[PDB]
Design a binder for this molecule. Sequence first.
Ligand SMILES: *[C@@H]1O[C@H](CO)[C@@H](O)[C@H](O)[C@H]1NC(C)=O
Ligand SMILES: *[C@@H]1O[C@H](CO)[C@@H](O)[C@H](O)[C@H]1NC(C)=O
Ligand SMILES: *[C@@H]1O[C@H](CO)[C@@H](O)[C@H](O)[C@H]1NC(C)=O
Ligand SMILES: *[C@@H]1O[C@H](CO)[C@@H](O)[C@H](O)[C@H]1NC(C)=O
Ligand SMILES: [Cl-]
Ligand SMILES: [Cl-]
Lengths: 532, 529
Amino acid sequence: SELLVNTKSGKVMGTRVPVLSSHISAFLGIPFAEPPVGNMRFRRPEPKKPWSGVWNASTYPNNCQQYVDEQFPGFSGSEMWNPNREMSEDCLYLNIWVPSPRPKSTTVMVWIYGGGFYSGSSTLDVYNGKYLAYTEEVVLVSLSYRVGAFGFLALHGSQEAPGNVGLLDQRMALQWVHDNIQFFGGDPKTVTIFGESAGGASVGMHILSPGSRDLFRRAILQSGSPNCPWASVSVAEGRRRAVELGRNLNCNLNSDEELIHCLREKKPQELIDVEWNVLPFDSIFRFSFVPVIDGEFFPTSLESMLNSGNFKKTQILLGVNKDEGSFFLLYGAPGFSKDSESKISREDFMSGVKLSVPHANDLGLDAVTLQYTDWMDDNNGIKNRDGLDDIVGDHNVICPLMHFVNKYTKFGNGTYLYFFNHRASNLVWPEWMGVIHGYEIEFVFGLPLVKELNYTAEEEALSRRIMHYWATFAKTGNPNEPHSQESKWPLFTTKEQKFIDLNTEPMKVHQRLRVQMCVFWNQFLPKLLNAT
Amino acid sequence: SELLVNTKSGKVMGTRVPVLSSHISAFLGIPFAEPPVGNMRFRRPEPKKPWSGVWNASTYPNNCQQYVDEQFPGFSGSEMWNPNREMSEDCLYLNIWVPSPRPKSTTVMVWIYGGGFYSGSSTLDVYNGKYLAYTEEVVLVSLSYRVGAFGFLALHGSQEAPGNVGLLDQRMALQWVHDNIQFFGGDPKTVTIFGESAGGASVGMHILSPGSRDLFRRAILQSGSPNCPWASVSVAEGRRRAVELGRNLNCNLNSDEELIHCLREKKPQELIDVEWNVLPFDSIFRFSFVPVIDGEFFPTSLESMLNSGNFKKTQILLGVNKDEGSFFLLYGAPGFSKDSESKISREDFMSGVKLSVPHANDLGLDAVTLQYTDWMDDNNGIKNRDGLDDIVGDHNVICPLMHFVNKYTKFGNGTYLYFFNHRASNLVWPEWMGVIHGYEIEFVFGLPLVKELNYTAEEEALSRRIMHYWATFAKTGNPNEPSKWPLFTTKEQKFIDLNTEPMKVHQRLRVQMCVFWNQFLPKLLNATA
Ligand SMILES: *[C@@H]1O[C@H](CO)[C@@H](O)[C@H](O)[C@H]1NC(C)=O
Ligand SMILES: *[C@@H]1O[C@H](CO)[C@@H](O)[C@H](O)[C@H]1NC(C)=O
Ligand SMILES: *[C@@H]1O[C@H](CO)[C@@H](O)[C@H](O)[C@H]1NC(C)=O
Ligand SMILES: *[C@@H]1O[C@H](CO)[C@@H](O)[C@H](O)[C@H]1NC(C)=O
Ligand SMILES: [Cl-]
Ligand SMILES: [Cl-]
């Protein structure tokens, strides 16, 4: 049978699903690890032990325990990102979409969800893999990993809570794919890992971590990179936050052993209720439990590894959205509202930059302000809003990524860069937010192809070329179909630094994506902050 | 006679001169101090002792001892600023042009030449006062003062070489105008001092100094302000450059008295030959002997005085030129040439900013470089050149002036700001240098009104409205006669362009770059230097 597959861990039974007038096979909620429960919370994952009988893989699994956004109750804009399945610590599962009839040795793409390392689910409607698997005839896998304290509590030295376990969950899902995907018609030698934001940072992390390199062929990073300021913390900072979590829960803080034991006895929701209290400052775009630069998953600092070429040399395709920062200003900065133009007063602009660049000293704050302020027109609320939008996006996503792409390209085997700037026709968010963080995903996954979703014909066309770019890249390491009549996406080279826009208009090639501001964020500001 | 005038120090005989198919009276080279020679070198000026008989005031006086530019021999562009009279330490004189017939109590304008405090003469062709005095019917005076070591060698504590004597020379010429101008038909109660660059900074210094405030009614500052980075030094820095001057000359350095005695034995040229060697850095737009913040001529720091309102409250008219910095890049930065477009490489740009902001640490240089570099086109020689040009002008002239203007307007009684950007059709310098430092002067003095000078008719028109703006301001405290030149205000910050086109009003002259130079860089340097 097409739906019955025997894996190295046991048999599995999938389901036939409809997809754009055709059908495809789906294996949902396949376990790849032992439930990280009880005494295993905070521990490295362990391989799922073989089960006997047939595993029913006809329904989505549970979502990992995570904070749930209740800012706009009933609002689809925010809720599409919340867990749409019951939450449980028993959440290490993966989903697979296989073309029907089953391919022989086809390209595999593994999706890693984002959510700032504190949230995310593999089961969201936007991650529904059937459209891309069907359309580009690839074997699509969506994995899952522990988020929040459950995935990244880090007490360096301890082997009960080392930190980086969510990254290890991802790796185990990758090992599972390397071991069993051939049984689904996938080629373990041609797997592309791709993810957005936290997922994108994750992808870059596996490119960096020796232990992950050999488990995939190449990578796609969307709106995220390993070096993002919010994507990792030092062992010290990580230890401090773990201990602060204990303090907030009245825990015995005498030894890791006791602290951890105390934390293992709490119900998930108790950890989550206090999750945000351990952050260093009042800030936006900062999350409590994230990867730690441990000297293990990451041999040395990310900068030194990037500098020395100490990472997987392959082909990468990556990019950003025009307004990565808007989502975060809306939720944490004064003056922003989803029901108004959100014109920002100079006073709010000032507090906005402090929130946005929490680690900066006064001189640092002044530099950012000067860099993003039009002094001929400083009370212009729109320029103030947009200025703050750019600050959040440039500092958190765009510049860290440009740094990564420039460093990576010195050693890599091909880099393709994009700038996604199409504002969807059916977007429920206010216009000031622009091309929002995460909204290129529905195009990557082919959502615009489903008519009931009411996207424009130009949007369906954009989705199809994006899916083909992504897939062709996954298959060959080049988004372009060699000798083809269509415009060509040029390689990003260290000299020319070319990149293309991704929208409904004919392709435009540009150079040096936001160089000016990124020179400020990547070179000058760090120099000024180091000064003292 | 009309040319024979009795002043409080003695009689003087002027001369009738031609001015645009007409004539006026000119009293050239009137002494206002005792010759600052021999033992008087470095000392405060002394009032000129009365003479008997008639002083011959028919010809220009000597120029003060100064560095002479020989970079471009025979070249009129550079040579027009060089002394055109013999140089002598006996140089403290003033000249006066009086309308004919001699008016009754008329507005007086006193010119203070620039030259970075190390050079300058009152006798240059471009400072010829006859056209302005005639056209605008004002009594025009041009004074002189000691420059270089002779006027600013500062050994604070010593009464032999106190520092600021060049400024005191200027003060005594003003005191002389206060005392005698009424005999030339001038109103001592309506005196306007005006000067360019070091002269403009000088004017600003008299506004600040208690000892000078009551010797003039209003002030005009052209391309210079008191707070300019090159316009003053601390007593400690002035003292070390003095000592270094002696070191360069094999002087006894055991005591101020010995050092000074040694320096007074040296021939003027010996001093001048090593003058530049005392500067603390390889730099441009930096001069060795300048005003010292002594606690006497300047009670306290310039900023504190500006902040507390400790200065003369009156009307000020002031402005800058579009390309203040190019002259200095041409002379001291790699890559520039008078005979080429001077496209500037990246290497030369980096070198250039280091020369322009000598005092900055590396972070400071990075900040400046970032602020003026187009990272989408960093190898554009033209942009690199124009960028360096803006850095020099913004940092040395424009932003310091804007800072002065904003601080002064809080307390002042009327500010008029201009931005001169007309490139003279007959300039001999290359296009890349643009609207050069000092070239608005010829329009202020009315040179475009003389036909054999070959200016265009709209240039003569421009000169006339500038002269009238200047003289009307001098007479009333308002350039406007009842298109209006708006009052610069703390809130609005309006200013006008000065060119051949119809007057346009703008606001916040180079506010973006000036926030950087006036607020951010100083803060950065204070936090990390
Ligand atoms: C697997 O679960 C789905 C829904 O619960 C159900 O329709 C189906 O019959 C199940 N298959 C088996 C063999 O239990
Ligand atoms: C990728 O690698 C092969 C050699 O391993 C080389 O010939 C080719 O030029 C490389 N491609 C790029 C874009 O670096
Ligand atoms: C004034 O001096 C000049 C020469 O320097 C001379 O030609 C002129 O006649 C003199 N006038 C008188 C009255 O001495
Ligand atoms: C100058 O002073 C007079 C009287 O004190 C005052 O009415 C006027 O407003 C002042 N002018 C300005 C522009 O400050
Ligand atoms: Cl469907
Ligand atoms: Cl004439």
